[PDB]
Structure formats: C-alpha cells, structure tokens
Chains A and B, each alone.
Chain A
C-alpha cells in the first residue's frame, strides 16, 4: 500500500 514511486510518474 505504498504510493507509486517517482519513476512511475
């Protein structure tokens, strides 16, 4: 349930 990481933006 962690947020998407910056690489997924």
Chain B
C-alpha cells in the first residue's frame, strides 16, 4: 500500500530499506504502514 502522507522509502548503503518521515525529519527501519 502507499506510505502515509509525508513519508518515503529508500535503500540504505547496506541495502536495507529505511523509511523517511518528512513530517518530523526523522527516519526508521520500521515500516509505518
């Protein structure tokens, strides 16, 4: 499904996806969906 408003996902150097919270200018390994 689509990420919540303000979020995106990218891949870290180690290849693991991380999620980016532009609403609070923070990131996390955990999927927010």
Chain A positions within 8 Å of B, measured between CB atoms, are 1, 3-6, 9
Measured between beta carbons, the chain A residues less than 8 angstroms from B20 are 6, 9
Total number of residue pairs linking A and B with CB closer than 8 Å: 20
Measured between beta carbons, the chain A residues less than 8 angstroms from B12 are 3-4
B33 at the interface (CB under 8 A from A): no
Q: How many residues of B contact A (CB 8 A)?
A: 13
Residue from B21, B25, B27 within 8 A of A4 (CB atoms): B27
Task: Give the nearest-CB partner of B25 in chain A.
Answer: A6
B28 touches A3 (CB 8 A): yes
CA of A3 to CA of B16, assembled, Å: 9
Chain A CB within 10 Å, residue with most, of B12, B27, B29: B27
